[PDB]
Amino acid sequence: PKPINVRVTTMDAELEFAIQPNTTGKQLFDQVVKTIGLREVWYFGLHYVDNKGFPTWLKLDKKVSAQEVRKENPLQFKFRAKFYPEDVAEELIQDITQKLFFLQVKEGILSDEIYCPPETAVLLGSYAVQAKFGDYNKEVHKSGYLSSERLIPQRVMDQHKLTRDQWEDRIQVWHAEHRGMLKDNAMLEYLKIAQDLEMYGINYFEIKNKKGTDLWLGVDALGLNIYEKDDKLTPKIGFPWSEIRNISFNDKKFVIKPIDKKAPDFVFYAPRLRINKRILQLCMGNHELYMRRRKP
């Protein structure tokens, strides 16, 4: 049948090819992973923009054409990590898997998506520099080699009065320390530090409790968390996966069910139904990757 053009990009690559009207996300997903040689497939997914202009994760069991991928030529997809390990240093096996997490995480940090203290920003940047430029040359890297490199998130530059050259220096000092550090190690250290940030690996959604006050819901690898609208850094309430029996909503009425009893039980509400759908798949996937790392 009439081939359908599609482009799939990873954090550092563009792949374009043709599929058929009956091709499944799984079938598209597979070609993508086998092409780049990544087998730790449980962290990833393919997401797109629908005809309405809205973010959407591709279902792997249904026909690609069976979902509303914005009509255009070709269709556009982003291969990204949908789930994070509880500990990158111990779990991530492949280099590719590592590289891909290093890049997506660094992108969220550089975009001000993930809050980051000024000091942790220069150290993270120092590692990104290592991974890229190398060991550090005083001949090749004459003041100004980091001139073109966007190294500190803007929201951080916004709160600390420093010259673009000022930072570049702060970074250089730390760069120099990592003597002959392997590029593949530099990336893991960056992730070892990013991992400790309070907003790392969390998906936030706006909600309201029965009492109707605005709050943030966070879904992550360790479980769920409830936050006050004005503070995404410190969870007001924490419900680890271990402590959560069943999570489910009816109609905007989500409810968390515990294991041990005492919990009066949490009940929140979310607006658009588009959201409440993703929320549930995130819990499901996280809850299940949680259990695997712990068999029996």
HSE, CB side, 13 Å, CA atoms: give it for residue 291. 9
55-57 and 203-209 as β-strands: parallel, antiparallel, unpaired?
Answer: unpaired
Separation between Cα atoms, residue 115 and residue 269, nearest integer Å? 26
Q: Which fold has domain 3-81?
A: Ubiquitin-like (UB roll) (3.10.20)
HEC profile for the chain? CCCEEEEEEECCEEEEEEECCCCEHHHHHHHHHHHHCCCCHHHEEEEEEECCCCEEECCCCCEHHHCCECCCCCEEEEEEECCCCCCHHHHCCCHHHHHHHHHHHHHHHHCCCCCCCHHHHHHHHHHHHHHHHCCCCCCCCCCCCCCCCCCCCHHHHHHCCCCHHHHHHHHHHHHHHCCCCCHHHHHHHHHHHHCCCCCCCCEEEEEEECCCCEEEEEECCCEEEEEECCECCCCCEEEECCCEEEEEECCCCEEEEECCCCCCCCEEECCCHHHHHHHHHHHHHHHHHHHHCCCC
| Measured distance between the N- and C-terminal CA atoms of the chain, rounded to whole angstroms | 47
Kindly list the distances between the CA atom of residue 9 and the CA atoms of 5, 23, 58, 80, 222, in Å, as whole numbers in the listed order. Answer: 14, 18, 14, 9, 28
Q: Which residues contact 21 (CB under 8 A, 6 or more apart)?
A: 1, 2, 4, 63, 65
Q: Which residues contact 27 (CB under 8 A, 6 or more apart)?
A: 19
Q: Structure solved using which method?
A: X-ray
Are the C-beta atoms of 60 and 24 separated by less than 8 Å? yes
- Going by C-alpha positions, the residue among 268, 227, 231 that lies closest to residue 250 is 268
Kindly list the distances between the CA atom of residue 51 and the CA atoms of 14, 82, 155, in Å, as whole numbers in the listed order. Answer: 22, 22, 32
Separation between Cα atoms, residue 47 and residue 24, nearest integer Å? 14
Separation between Cα atoms, residue 129 and residue 228, nearest integer Å? 36
Are the C-beta atoms of 25 and 58 separated by less than 8 Å? yes
**CATH number of the 200-290 domain:** 2.30.29.30
Separation between Cα atoms, residue 210 and residue 238, nearest integer Å? 18
- For 82-198, which CATH class? mainly alpha
Residue 1 structure tokens: 């049948």
Separation between Cα atoms, residue 178 and residue 186, nearest integer Å? 8
Sequence spans of domains, the chain: 3-81, 82-198, 200-290
